[PDB]
Nucleic acid binder design. Structure first.
Lengths: 17, 107, 479, 81, 81, 64
RNA sequence: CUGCAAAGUACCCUCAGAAGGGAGGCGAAAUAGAGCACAGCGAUAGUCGGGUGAGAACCCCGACGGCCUAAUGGAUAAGGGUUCCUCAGCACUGCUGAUCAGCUGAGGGUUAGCCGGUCCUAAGUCAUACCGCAACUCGACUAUGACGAAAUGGGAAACGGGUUAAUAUUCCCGUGCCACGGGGUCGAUCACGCUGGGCAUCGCCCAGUCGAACCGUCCAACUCCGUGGAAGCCGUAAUGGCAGGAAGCGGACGAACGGCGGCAUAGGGAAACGUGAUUC
RNA sequence: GACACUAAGUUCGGCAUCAAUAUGGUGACCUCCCGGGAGCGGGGGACCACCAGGUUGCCUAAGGAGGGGUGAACCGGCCCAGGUCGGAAACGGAGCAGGUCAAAACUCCCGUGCUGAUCAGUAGUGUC
């Protein structure tokens, strides 16, 4: 859980300028 | 030292507390800082547009609703730049009257 | 840093090797100093390294290449420290913080005070750095920040007076851990080193901690030796490890004092003291020091969770929006990166490899947007839906949070994607349940059911396992 | 919550005899549903055992049943007496 | 030319056999049989093979349960890979 | 790929054998991670096999 | 015959749902959006609560009520071939439904010196040689060789305990072993004792009370030797036996998947961890 | 003793409860100025709603300026974290969430007017 949830959260913030 | 003219000042759709500075009878639909600058610069007034500034009493964040316009009244020595423009009220009003004439509005 | 790549550089094929090694050795060895350049040392390391080889082999059942590492890593700790503990406190403790000018003594004293106050001890900070006039105000302010009382022992006419007032204050305020912050001084300044020795004989300190900056160079050896010979000093604090200095000074200090390195100073924040020891540098240094990190994951998570100290808030009750709670973890999951975020994407991210904190500042801004939402929207089974049916609500939230309409829809879209791993099954709902009836309590539940009897180290282990929001997914995949 | 005497069992004779027990169980459910509008029809096992006492074919002509209503939604919980 | 050993078989069951009965499990070639598996294993891991038991599959490979001597003992051999 | 036919013929009879036993080892270690995580890089575990085939082919052509 | 190009459908509503639908977006075109201009049977069976679930008459828990007793129980041959176990599912299949499955998908699972194959030979079969035939992939005899038994022919050697989601006399622990009419156990019943269960006016009713292969030892029957010396005696369920020596007495050879001791301060069991007997 | 009538007691229900004014507030909106580079600082008029306790109409069978509640996602007023906007700053503004309320609105319970029914059977008077 901690991986995706945290990684998607991470990947989203970077991509959305 | 130039003065400040926010579209809220010339908006007939705004109440007093919302930032209107001139009588509704003379106010205008939805003046845009651009239009304000375009009519002022075309009278011999020295003015520059502060495109991104936003009026504090303006809850909206859109574009048509923001920006600021700066006009030079007096000159460093003291003489008014244009005799017909003493106060700020003078400019506001002059603007409120000329915008509903801009081709872009009569269209 | 770019040697820390020699690491995976380097892991690849195993069709070549010893050369691979010595190069890498030299390569690594280059990016450092190297031997004989700033000191002298290195020969030693790069030696000891070798030594081993022609005396060992990787226990079978394991590719050599790897092993090499354990040893590399292993020597690396060895060169900038190797640690386990922590200090053993008694009824009454009086410690000194000593070291070169600018090493981090005053900040470390405040960190120690906060660390132990949380452990239930009565701390008293003693500002005895008189040379620097601004220095007493500095510790006074830190004391206020951590809520640890501060005595500004500025009757320096005799150590005896300092002892008198420290004794009186400790008694009247039931202090049981006195931390004496001394002024920075050169290891060769006879008058000041003599003053430090004098202060020590009068105050009767248990522990004398040498605060050493991680960036300290070749002179770390002479500095550690001089402080040790003149003030008896046992134990060390290695500061500024949040920088990129390799930290070899730690090995130098360890080698000549034989006193263990109790704590690591990471950041400038009052709670950024820890503990990790040489393991994390070892990890540092490797690409796993986003494995090692996930100590930080665990170690600092038990933090969650106990007695609701988290200010109810944190992941806990805030945990309802889970969505609110997930934002806190991502908040503390920023915070700051334990391992590489697997993340599931790349799309510009434009390097997007890291910023912390910047990552945590983002979660905070999303939190401020949700601060503009109301209970109906926050506790709704599908908060995104409540705004699809009533788009007027979007406009209000944006107004109150000083954000744009698009920013709120973005948060809503992100929440949607979040709730979906969280959804990844079952999504929100099974995680919230488990999540509202469990999560901590739903590891707590588990915490209460499968602690008991476990010592504190054991409970942190268990808390890390919980943690897991897929450990249940691990366990069911296991089966 | 009250005590009631279920006949409707008499009606179970209108079905052949080798199946009277299941018919019984249904009649009790419908009886308690009715009279007793606010009464869901959970039948405690005791009642089931009562009817099935002498086998599927030899149901008694009557059973005394103690039943309880909670008021809101219309449930009922019912047992033997 | 084909090689005898393919790869270790790691599974729960293979672990119990390693820990408690001390054997190693491999995937391999079947037609290695059994002698060949015993020799190959020895020469690769430097050990003494006491017995080999073989099964075809299904997988399309072959599985060999190779039990080592007590002094070799097996947890260690497997740990280095 | 990384190992060409010319380079194999270039090598001595002894260097082929040494190169051979080297490739086998890379292979064996790839298969190892092979059973318990795969680091990798599929293109190579396949190349290792072909490389080995080439060497053996050449050893045969040359007479060792 | 997707399309010029993946532009192969973002976002939102709905739903148990990465399904589907609505809305919307792309393109000249989406009617170009993906294989794309149900009782009958000697087996009449459920009912009440509860669990899970979007959904429960039939999926699971408990209680009550029943069905099968040479079988609806246990172990297996052939044959099947992964149907086994786990997890996720429900468009297909299931005489209704299904959250269930022998279904769909993905993973996992079968471990041997002492179990069996393998070895031997059976009825018989094939091959080579010989000979025949127009000729052979054809044909009988004779030679030589080989084949021909997995429950169920012959046969070197393993028991007890433990362990997995799924194997087990194979793995693990310990120990053992090999090659180079009459006799009588299980079961069943009876008697009495011990353990624990049920029922409750009776004092009865139920279950258990265990423990291998193997190693060692013992014997009946049959046959035979010595002694002895029957002329009517010995013996059987019955036939029968004898001076070509009967009974008796003493010996030799000599059985069980049987007894007894070990194997076991092995294993197993919540506990007691029995003893005799009958029919066998 | 038994009945009646007026006064009247108990209880559970029903229906219904103005208008126009002064002074002081709060709020909203409009309209004029002065000052200022912004956020603004300062001052004069007008209208509407509501509140506090205060009159009176010549007003109704009654009509007290009573006591709660809710205050809605926003859409009443205040105080407004954060964030936002103006500002180099100091600060100031708009303002969600949150809190709050003599004074948007909406609602109860009081009292007060008639009013079914109930219970009591006392107070008087009258009859046979």
């Amino acid at each position: 859980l901690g991986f995706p949830i945290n990684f998607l959260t991470l990947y989203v913030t970077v991509q959305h300028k | 030292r130039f003065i400040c003219i926010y579209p809220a000042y010339l908006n007939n759709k705004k109440t007093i507390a919302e930032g209107r500075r001139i009588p509704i009878s003379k106010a205008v639909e939805n003046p845009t800082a651009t239009e304000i600058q375009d009519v002022c610069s075309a009278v011999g007034l020295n003015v520059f547009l502060e495109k991104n500034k936003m009026y504090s009493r303006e809850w909206n964040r859109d574009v048509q609703y923001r920006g600021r316009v700066r006009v030079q009244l007096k000159q460093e020595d003291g003489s008014l730049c244009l005799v017909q423009f003493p106060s700020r009220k003078s400019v506001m009003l002059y603007a409120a009257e000329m915008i509903p004439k801009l081709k872009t509005r009569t269209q | 840093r770019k040697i820390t790549s020699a690491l995976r550089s380097l892991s690849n094929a195993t069709i070549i090797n010893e050369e691979v090694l010595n190069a890498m050795l030299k390569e690594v060895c280059t990016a450092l100093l190297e031997a004989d350049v700033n000191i002298k040392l290195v020969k030693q390391l790069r030696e000891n390294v070798k030594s081993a080889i022609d005396l060992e082999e990787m226990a079978s059942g394991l590719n050599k290449r790897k092993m090499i590492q354990h040893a590399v890593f292993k020597e690396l700790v060895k060169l900038v420290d190797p640690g386990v503990k922590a200090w053993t406190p008694t009824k009454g403790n009086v410690i000194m913080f000593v070291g070169l000018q600018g090493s981090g003594k005053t900040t470390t004293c405040s960190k120690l005070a906060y660390y132990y106050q949380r452990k239930g001890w009565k701390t008293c900070l003693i500002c005895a750095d008189t040379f620097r006039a601004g220095a007493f105000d500095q510790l006074k302010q830190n004391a206020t920040k951590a809520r640890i009382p501060f005595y500004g022992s500025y009757t320096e006419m005799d150590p005896v007076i300092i002892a008198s007032e420290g004794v009186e204050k400790f008694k009247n305020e039931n202090f049981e851990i006195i931390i004496v912050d001394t002024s920075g001084r050169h290891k060769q300044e006879d008058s000041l080193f003599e003053e430090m020795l004098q202060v020590a004989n009068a105050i009767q300190p248990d522990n004398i901690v040498y605060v050493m900056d991680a960036s300290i160079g070749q002179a770390c050896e002479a500095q550690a030796k001089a402080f040790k010979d003149k003030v008896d000093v046992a134990s060390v604090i290695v500061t500024k490890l949040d920088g990129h200095a390799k930290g070899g000074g730690a090995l130098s200090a360890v080698a000549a004092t034989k006193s263990p390195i109790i704590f690591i100073g990471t950041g400038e924040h009052i709670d950024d003291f820890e503990p990790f020891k040489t393991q994390p540098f070892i990890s540092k240094l490797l690409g796993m020091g986003d494995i090692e990190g996930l100590i930080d994951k665990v170690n600092e998570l038990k933090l969650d969770d106990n007695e609701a100290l988290i200010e109810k808030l944190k992941h806990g009750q805030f945990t309802l929006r889970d969505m609110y709670e997930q934002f806190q973890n991502i908040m503390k999951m920023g915070p700051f990166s334990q391992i590489l975020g697997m993340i599931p994407g790349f799309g510009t991210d434009f390097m997007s490899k890291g910023n912390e904190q910047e990552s945590m500042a983002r979660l905070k801004k999303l939190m401020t947007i949700m601060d503009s939402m109301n209970d109906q929207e926050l506790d709704s089974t599908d908060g995104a839906k409540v705004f699809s049916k009533q788009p007027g609500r979007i406009q209000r939230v944006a107004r109150g949070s000083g954000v744009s309409t698009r920013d709120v829809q973005e948060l809503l879209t992100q929440y949607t994607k979040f709730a979906q791993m969280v959804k990844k099954m079952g999504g929100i709902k099974g995680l919230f349940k488990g999540g509202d009836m469990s999560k901590n309590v739903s590891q707590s539940q588990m915490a209460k059911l499968n602690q008991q009897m476990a010592k504190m180290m054991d409970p942190r282990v268990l808390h890390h396992m919980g943690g897991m929001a897929g450990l249940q997914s691990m366990m069911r995949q296991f089966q | 919550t009250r005590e009631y005497t279920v006949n409707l069992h008499k009606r179970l004779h209108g079905c052949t005899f080798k199946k009277k027990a299941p018919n019984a169980i249904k009649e009790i459910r419908k009886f308690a549903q009715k009279a007793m509008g606010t009464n869901d029809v959970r039948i405690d096992v005791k009642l089931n055992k009562h009817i099935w006492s002498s086998g599927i074919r030899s149901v008694p002509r009557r059973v005394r049943v103690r039943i309880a209503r909670k008021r809101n939604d219309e449930e009922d919980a019912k047992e033997e007496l | 030319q084909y090689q005898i050993l393919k790869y270790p078989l790691t599974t729960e069951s293979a672990m119990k056999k390693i820990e408690d009965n001390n054997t190693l499990v491999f995937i391999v070639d079947l037609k290695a049989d059994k002698k060949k598996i015993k020799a190959a294993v020895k020469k690769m891991y430097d050990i003494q093979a006491k017995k080999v038991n073989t099964l075809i599959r299904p997988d399309g490979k072959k599985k060999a349960y190779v039990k080592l001597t007590p002094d070799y003992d097996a947890l260690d051999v497997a740990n280095k890979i | 790929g990384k190992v060409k036919a010319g380079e194999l013929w270039n090598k001595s009879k002894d260097d082929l054998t040494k190169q051979l036993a080297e490739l086998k080892t890379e292979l064996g270690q790839l298969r190892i991670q092979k059973v318990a995580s795969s680091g990798s890089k599929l293109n190579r575990i396949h190349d290792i096999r072909k490389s080995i085939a080439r060497v053996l082919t050449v050893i045969n052509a040359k007479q060792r």
